[PDB]
Structures are given as C-alpha cells and as structure tokens.
Amino acid sequence: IVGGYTCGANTVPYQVSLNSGYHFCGGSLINSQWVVSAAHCYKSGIQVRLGEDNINVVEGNEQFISASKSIVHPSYNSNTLNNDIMLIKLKSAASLNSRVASISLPTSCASAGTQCLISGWGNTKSSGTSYPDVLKCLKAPILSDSSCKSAYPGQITSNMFCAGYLEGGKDSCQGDSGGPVVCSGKLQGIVSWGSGCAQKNKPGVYTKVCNYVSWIKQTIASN
Numbered sequence: 001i002v003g004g005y006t007c008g009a010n011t012v013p014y015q016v017s018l019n020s021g022y023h024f025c026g027g028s029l030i031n032s033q034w035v036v037s038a039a040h041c042y043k044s045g046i047q048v049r050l051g052e053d054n055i056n057v058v059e060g061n062e063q064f065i066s067a068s069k070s071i072v073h074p075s076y077n078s079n080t081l082n083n084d085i086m087l088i089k090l091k092s093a094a095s096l097n098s099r100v101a102s103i104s105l106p107t108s109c110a111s112a113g114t115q116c117l118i119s120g121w122g123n124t125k126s127s128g129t130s131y132p133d134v135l136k137c138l139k140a141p142i143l144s145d146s147s148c149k150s151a152y153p154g155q156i157t158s159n160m161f162c163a164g165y166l167e168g169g170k171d172s173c174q175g176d177s178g179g180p181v182v183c184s185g186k187l188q189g190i191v192s193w194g195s196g197c198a199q200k201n202k203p204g205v206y207t208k209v210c211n212y213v214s215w216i217k218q219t220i221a222s223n
C-alpha cells in the first residue's frame with residue numbers, strides 16, 4: 001500500500017497473509033474454513049496466516065493453518081486477469097475471535113463513489129521498494145466504469161472495477177495481491193492488477209466479488 005496508513009494491530013481481522021516460506025499474497029477469511037484470494041496468487045504449499053499484524057514477529061494472536069485445497073475459478077484467464085479469484089480451504093477450522101474474524105460476502109454490488117478499505121503488506125513506494133512489517137490500509141473510492149475503462153482501454157471486463165485516485169500517490173502495490181477491498185462491511189474486491197503503483201491515471205483494478213457469490217457458495221457447499 002502506497003500513501004496509506006498503519007491500520008493498527010488486528011483492526012482488519014479478516015486479512016490473511018499467504019505464506020510459502022515468505023509472505024507472497026494477501027487474502028480474506030470468509031468463514032472458519034475458507035479464504036478468498038486472487039487466482040494469480042495460486043501456488044502449492046500455502047500456509048494461511050491469520051491474526052497477523054507484524055508478519056516477521058510472533059506477537060501472540062496468530063493462527064498458522066496449512067491449506068488443504070485451492071480452487072481457482074473455472075474461467076480464470078491469467079493473461080487478461082478475467083475471473084481473478086480463488087478459494088483456499090484450511091486443513092482445520094480457524095478459531096474465530098476478536099482478532100480473527102470472517103468478512104461477509106456481498107449481496108449487491110457496490111456503487112461508484114463508495115469508499116472502501118484496501119489492506120496489505122505490499123510495497124509502500126511508487127518508485128523503489130520498501131516493505132512494511134505491519135499491516136497497511138488505504139481508504140479509496142470506487143471509480144466510475146467509464147473512468148476505469150478510459151484508464152485501461154480495451155482491458156476492463158464486467159468482472160473488474162477500479163478504485164483509487166486518478167492523480168496517483170495512493171494505491172495498492174506489489175505484495176498486496178489477493179487482498180481485500182471492503183466496502184460497507186462487505187468483501188467487494190480482490191487486489192488484482194494495475195500498471196505500476198500509485199501512477200497518475202492508473203488506479204488499481206479489482207476483481208468484482210459480487211459476480212462470484214453464487215460460485216463461492218456452491219463451491220464451499222461441496223468441498
């Protein structure tokens with residue numbers, strides 16, 4: 001997250017870190033046994049880390065749970081990033097508490113202009129590199145579909161939306177992949193793609209979670 005703020009420990013209790021020897025992606029806890037992340041975060045050997053603030057220090061509220069199964073969306077296209085969503089099943093249920101909590105799925109899609117909370121442990125620089133150890137947050141509005149399409153001509157599908165700031169300076173960035181975009185208390189987006197970070201006229205592009213609720217529900221009812 002570039003141009004954001006330190007969330008505060010465990011104030012985003014649905015945020016997970018995906019770990020394969022190192023943090024490589026975020027995700028969102030949707031119930032005690034499942035995480036939603038980006039399909040472009042898929043790899044084997046994932047450990048889910050819940051209750052994190054500082055990802056390099058054991059602070060006392062963590063739960064580390066290996067993944068048993070990952071399910072990439074059936075129509076995921078890694079070239080276009082259309083349908084950039086995946087479910088990850090935990091090998092054992094998380095213990096839900098004040099610091100480890102699920103985020104609700106949407107029942108309606110969010111509106112342009114709504115302010116959302118984007119979070120992650122990604123780079124905090126638009127040029128150069130610095131990784132925070134503690135969770136960073138950004139408040140960002142959903143952009144109109146016409147601004148989004150004008151920013152990324154030929155590339156925005158109905159399964160995507162833009163959020164952020166056209167003037168740049170405030171955005172998600174490398175390492176935030178797969179993490180939440182929460183609007184009105186519901187998981188509405190997943191950190192998906194963009195051109196650079198915090199560049200002018202190049203906001204973040206997020207997977208439109210509301211279009212996937214029926215797939216998520218059916219998938220978790222059978223796995």
Ligand SMILES: *[B@]1(C2=[C][C]=C([C]SC([N])=[N])[C]=[C]2)O[C]([O])C(=O)O1
Binds near residue numbers: 024122194198204
């Ligand atoms: B991801 C990843 C981070 C950030 C985006 C948004 S870019 C922007 N302009 N808002 C995307 C995708 O990619 C790498 O795989 C990583 O681990 O983070």
Ligand SMILES: [Ca+2]
Binds near residue numbers: 055062
């Ligand atoms: Ca920790």
